[PDB]
């Protein structure tokens, strides 16, 4: 676990969330 | 919110999954 900012944050949310998406 | 917990601080993948719909 490291700092996740900007574009890297959205990519990590893309993979964690998958088809659910993110609020 | 997500920037405060994950960008300013550090969050696990378990805390990141909290932001999924």
């Amino acid at each position: 676990n490291q700092h996740l900012c900007g574009s890297h944050l959205v990519e990590a949310l893309y993979l964690v969330c998958g088809e659910r998406g993110f609020f | 919110g997500i920037v405060e917990q994950c960008c300013t601080s550090i969050c696990s993948l378990y805390q990141l999954e909290n932001y999924c719909n």
Side-chain angles (χ1 to χ4, degrees):
Chain A
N1 60 353
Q2 53 201 160
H3 305 270
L4 266 318
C5 296
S7 184
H8 297 116
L9 211 217
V10 343
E11 205 39 32
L13 272 174
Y14 280 21
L15 293 164
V16 169
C17 293
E19 338 172 0
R20 295 180 279 180
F22 46 92
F23 66 80
Chain B
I2 199 171
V3 178
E4 301 80 356
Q5 317 206 295
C6 289
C7 176
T8 303
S9 194
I10 296 173
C11 71
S12 55
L13 273 8
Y14 297 73
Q15 302 172 277
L16 207 237
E17 185 186 19
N18 291 330
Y19 298 94
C20 294
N21 296 323

